[PDB]
PDB file of all heavy atoms in Angstrom:
ATOM      1  N   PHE Z   9      10.616 -27.007   4.374  1.00 65.46           N
ATOM      2  CA  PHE Z   9      11.887 -27.064   5.118  1.00 65.46           C
ATOM      3  C   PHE Z   9      12.352 -28.443   5.435  1.00 65.46           C
ATOM      4  O   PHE Z   9      11.521 -29.425   5.487  1.00 65.46           O
ATOM      5  CB  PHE Z   9      11.622 -26.196   6.461  1.00 65.46           C
ATOM      6  CG  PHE Z   9      10.612 -26.681   7.457  1.00 65.46           C
ATOM      7  CD1 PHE Z   9      10.964 -27.287   8.632  1.00 65.46           C
ATOM      8  CD2 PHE Z   9       9.309 -26.319   7.141  1.00 65.46           C
ATOM      9  CE1 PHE Z   9      10.041 -27.601   9.582  1.00 65.46           C
ATOM     10  CE2 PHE Z   9       8.263 -26.610   8.151  1.00 65.46           C
ATOM     11  CZ  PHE Z   9       8.697 -27.246   9.332  1.00 65.46           C
ATOM     12  N   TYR Z  17      14.632 -34.823   9.701  1.00 62.49           N
ATOM     13  CA  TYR Z  17      13.130 -34.882  10.042  1.00 62.49           C
ATOM     14  C   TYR Z  17      12.366 -35.046   8.685  1.00 62.49           C
ATOM     15  O   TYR Z  17      11.254 -34.789   8.755  1.00 62.49           O
ATOM     16  CB  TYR Z  17      12.689 -33.783  10.918  1.00 62.49           C
ATOM     17  CG  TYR Z  17      13.064 -32.473  10.467  1.00 62.49           C
ATOM     18  CD1 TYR Z  17      12.240 -31.831   9.439  1.00 62.49           C
ATOM     19  CD2 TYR Z  17      14.153 -31.700  10.952  1.00 62.49           C
ATOM     20  CE1 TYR Z  17      12.621 -30.525   8.917  1.00 62.49           C
ATOM     21  CE2 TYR Z  17      14.403 -30.404  10.343  1.00 62.49           C
ATOM     22  CZ  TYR Z  17      13.644 -29.903   9.466  1.00 62.49           C
ATOM     23  OH  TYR Z  17      13.891 -28.664   8.895  1.00 62.49           O
ATOM     24  N   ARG Z  20       9.073 -31.095   5.576  1.00 57.49           N
ATOM     25  CA  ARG Z  20       7.856 -30.563   6.225  1.00 57.49           C
ATOM     26  C   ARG Z  20       7.586 -29.276   5.530  1.00 57.49           C
ATOM     27  O   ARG Z  20       8.376 -28.769   4.659  1.00 57.49           O
ATOM     28  CB  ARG Z  20       8.079 -30.322   7.702  1.00 57.49           C
ATOM     29  CG  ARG Z  20       8.478 -31.609   8.463  1.00 57.49           C
ATOM     30  CD  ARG Z  20       8.516 -31.475  10.011  1.00 57.49           C
ATOM     31  NE  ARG Z  20       7.267 -31.106  10.526  1.00 57.49           N
ATOM     32  CZ  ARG Z  20       6.252 -32.013  10.690  1.00 57.49           C
ATOM     33  NH1 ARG Z  20       6.365 -33.320  10.370  1.00 57.49           N
ATOM     34  NH2 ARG Z  20       5.116 -31.568  11.262  1.00 57.49           N
ATOM     35  N   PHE Z  22       5.205 -25.216   5.924  1.00 56.83           N
ATOM     36  CA  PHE Z  22       4.224 -24.386   6.515  1.00 56.83           C
ATOM     37  C   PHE Z  22       3.392 -24.003   5.212  1.00 56.83           C
ATOM     38  O   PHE Z  22       4.003 -23.443   4.195  1.00 56.83           O
ATOM     39  CB  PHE Z  22       4.715 -23.076   7.059  1.00 56.83           C
ATOM     40  CG  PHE Z  22       5.236 -23.373   8.513  1.00 56.83           C
ATOM     41  CD1 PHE Z  22       6.519 -23.640   8.761  1.00 56.83           C
ATOM     42  CD2 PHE Z  22       4.274 -23.368   9.475  1.00 56.83           C
ATOM     43  CE1 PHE Z  22       6.934 -23.965   9.982  1.00 56.83           C
ATOM     44  CE2 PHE Z  22       4.780 -23.606  10.770  1.00 56.83           C
ATOM     45  CZ  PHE Z  22       6.013 -24.019  11.062  1.00 56.83           C
ATOM     46  N   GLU Z  27       1.335 -26.214   9.669  1.00 56.92           N
ATOM     47  CA  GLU Z  27       2.596 -27.057   9.590  1.00 56.92           C
ATOM     48  C   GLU Z  27       2.036 -28.442   9.230  1.00 56.92           C
ATOM     49  O   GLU Z  27       1.241 -29.035   9.923  1.00 56.92           O
ATOM     50  CB  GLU Z  27       3.385 -26.998  10.808  1.00 56.92           C
ATOM     51  CG  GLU Z  27       4.718 -27.688  10.540  1.00 56.92           C
ATOM     52  CD  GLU Z  27       5.553 -27.866  11.946  1.00 56.92           C
ATOM     53  OE1 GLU Z  27       5.237 -27.229  12.828  1.00 56.92           O
ATOM     54  OE2 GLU Z  27       6.362 -28.856  11.935  1.00 56.92           O
ATOM     55  N   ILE Z  48      16.256 -25.747   7.526  1.00 57.15           N
ATOM     56  CA  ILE Z  48      16.073 -25.293   8.872  1.00 57.15           C
ATOM     57  C   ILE Z  48      16.660 -26.377   9.728  1.00 57.15           C
ATOM     58  O   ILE Z  48      16.305 -27.539   9.522  1.00 57.15           O
ATOM     59  CB  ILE Z  48      14.574 -24.999   9.322  1.00 57.15           C
ATOM     60  CG1 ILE Z  48      13.974 -23.932   8.394  1.00 57.15           C
ATOM     61  CG2 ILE Z  48      14.402 -24.687  10.803  1.00 57.15           C
ATOM     62  CD1 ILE Z  48      12.646 -23.592   8.677  1.00 57.15           C
ATOM     63  N   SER Z  49      17.610 -26.177  10.639  1.00 58.09           N
ATOM     64  CA  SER Z  49      18.099 -27.146  11.535  1.00 58.09           C
ATOM     65  C   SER Z  49      17.105 -27.670  12.420  1.00 58.09           C
ATOM     66  O   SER Z  49      16.180 -26.958  12.900  1.00 58.09           O
ATOM     67  CB  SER Z  49      19.252 -26.524  12.417  1.00 58.09           C
ATOM     68  OG  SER Z  49      19.869 -27.291  13.246  1.00 58.09           O
ATOM     69  N   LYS Z  50      17.144 -28.950  12.783  1.00 57.90           N
ATOM     70  CA  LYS Z  50      16.247 -29.540  13.757  1.00 57.90           C
ATOM     71  C   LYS Z  50      16.084 -28.680  15.031  1.00 57.90           C
ATOM     72  O   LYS Z  50      14.916 -28.462  15.515  1.00 57.90           O
ATOM     73  CB  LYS Z  50      16.609 -30.888  14.112  1.00 57.90           C
ATOM     74  CG  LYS Z  50      15.606 -31.620  14.996  1.00 57.90           C
ATOM     75  CD  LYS Z  50      16.080 -33.146  15.192  1.00 57.90           C
ATOM     76  CE  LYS Z  50      15.226 -33.707  16.481  1.00 57.90           C
ATOM     77  NZ  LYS Z  50      15.353 -35.242  16.356  1.00 57.90           N
ATOM     78  N   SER Z  51      17.235 -28.232  15.633  1.00 62.00           N
ATOM     79  CA  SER Z  51      17.219 -27.322  16.801  1.00 62.00           C
ATOM     80  C   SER Z  51      16.488 -26.041  16.688  1.00 62.00           C
ATOM     81  O   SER Z  51      16.097 -25.453  17.716  1.00 62.00           O
ATOM     82  CB  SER Z  51      18.691 -27.169  17.219  1.00 62.00           C
ATOM     83  OG  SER Z  51      19.350 -26.267  16.270  1.00 62.00           O
ATOM     84  N   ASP Z  52      16.306 -25.618  15.450  1.00 57.73           N
ATOM     85  CA  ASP Z  52      15.595 -24.217  15.266  1.00 57.73           C
ATOM     86  C   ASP Z  52      14.173 -24.335  14.951  1.00 57.73           C
ATOM     87  O   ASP Z  52      13.386 -23.386  14.889  1.00 57.73           O
ATOM     88  CB  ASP Z  52      16.371 -23.448  14.136  1.00 57.73           C
ATOM     89  CG  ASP Z  52      17.552 -22.880  14.741  1.00 57.73           C
ATOM     90  OD1 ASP Z  52      17.607 -22.378  15.895  1.00 57.73           O
ATOM     91  OD2 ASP Z  52      18.657 -22.901  13.997  1.00 57.73           O
ATOM     92  N   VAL Z  53      13.585 -25.729  14.826  1.00 58.38           N
ATOM     93  CA  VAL Z  53      12.215 -25.722  14.176  1.00 58.38           C
ATOM     94  C   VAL Z  53      11.234 -25.180  15.370  1.00 58.38           C
ATOM     95  O   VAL Z  53      10.268 -24.552  15.022  1.00 58.38           O
ATOM     96  CB  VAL Z  53      11.864 -27.111  13.909  1.00 58.38           C
ATOM     97  CG1 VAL Z  53      10.376 -27.438  13.592  1.00 58.38           C
ATOM     98  CG2 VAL Z  53      12.695 -27.568  12.672  1.00 58.38           C
ATOM     99  N   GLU Z  54      11.547 -25.472  16.623  1.00 59.37           N
ATOM    100  CA  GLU Z  54      10.658 -24.962  17.703  1.00 59.37           C
ATOM    101  C   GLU Z  54      10.469 -23.414  17.642  1.00 59.37           C
ATOM    102  O   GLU Z  54       9.336 -22.994  17.759  1.00 59.37           O
ATOM    103  CB  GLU Z  54      11.214 -25.398  19.101  1.00 59.37           C
ATOM    104  CG  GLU Z  54      10.265 -25.009  20.293  1.00 59.37           C
ATOM    105  CD  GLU Z  54      10.774 -25.607  21.578  1.00 59.37           C
ATOM    106  OE1 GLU Z  54      11.935 -25.502  21.839  1.00 59.37           O
ATOM    107  OE2 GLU Z  54       9.917 -26.070  22.388  1.00 59.37           O
ATOM    108  N   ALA Z  55      11.535 -22.654  17.523  1.00 61.71           N
ATOM    109  CA  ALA Z  55      11.388 -21.285  17.441  1.00 61.71           C
ATOM    110  C   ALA Z  55      10.642 -20.697  16.201  1.00 61.71           C
ATOM    111  O   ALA Z  55       9.892 -19.842  16.205  1.00 61.71           O
ATOM    112  CB  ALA Z  55      12.773 -20.568  17.435  1.00 61.71           C
ATOM    113  N   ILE Z  56      10.907 -21.386  15.042  1.00 61.67           N
ATOM    114  CA  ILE Z  56      10.202 -21.076  13.806  1.00 61.67           C
ATOM    115  C   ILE Z  56       8.744 -21.320  13.963  1.00 61.67           C
ATOM    116  O   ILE Z  56       7.943 -20.445  13.486  1.00 61.67           O
ATOM    117  CB  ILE Z  56      10.839 -21.807  12.536  1.00 61.67           C
ATOM    118  CG1 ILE Z  56      12.294 -21.552  12.413  1.00 61.67           C
ATOM    119  CG2 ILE Z  56      10.047 -21.498  11.187  1.00 61.67           C
ATOM    120  CD1 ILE Z  56      12.710 -19.982  12.268  1.00 61.67           C
ATOM    121  N   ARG Z  57       8.313 -22.442  14.540  1.00 65.48           N
ATOM    122  CA  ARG Z  57       6.896 -22.665  14.857  1.00 65.48           C
ATOM    123  C   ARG Z  57       6.280 -21.581  15.556  1.00 65.48           C
ATOM    124  O   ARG Z  57       5.242 -21.225  15.219  1.00 65.48           O
ATOM    125  CB  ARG Z  57       6.794 -23.878  15.723  1.00 65.48           C
ATOM    126  CG  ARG Z  57       6.962 -25.212  15.005  1.00 65.48           C
ATOM    127  CD  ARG Z  57       6.683 -26.344  15.849  1.00 65.48           C
ATOM    128  NE  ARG Z  57       6.778 -27.503  15.044  1.00 65.48           N
ATOM    129  CZ  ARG Z  57       7.486 -28.616  15.345  1.00 65.48           C
ATOM    130  NH1 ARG Z  57       8.059 -28.740  16.461  1.00 65.48           N
ATOM    131  NH2 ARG Z  57       7.535 -29.638  14.503  1.00 65.48           N
ATOM    132  N   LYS Z  58       7.040 -21.031  16.680  1.00 65.14           N
ATOM    133  CA  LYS Z  58       6.524 -19.953  17.492  1.00 65.14           C
ATOM    134  C   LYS Z  58       6.246 -18.778  16.620  1.00 65.14           C
ATOM    135  O   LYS Z  58       5.235 -18.092  16.742  1.00 65.14           O
ATOM    136  CB  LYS Z  58       7.478 -19.630  18.602  1.00 65.14           C
ATOM    137  CG  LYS Z  58       7.005 -18.595  19.543  1.00 65.14           C
ATOM    138  CD  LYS Z  58       8.156 -18.212  20.635  1.00 65.14           C
TER     139      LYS Z  58
END
Side-chain angles (χ1 to χ4, degrees), chain Z residues 9 17 20 22 27 48-57:
Chain Z
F9 59 106
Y17 51 80
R20 301 186 65 75
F22 279 96
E27 189 191 341
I48 301 181
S49 180
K50 185 178 163 159
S51 62
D52 285 317
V53 173
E54 181 175 46
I56 302 307
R57 281 186 175 129

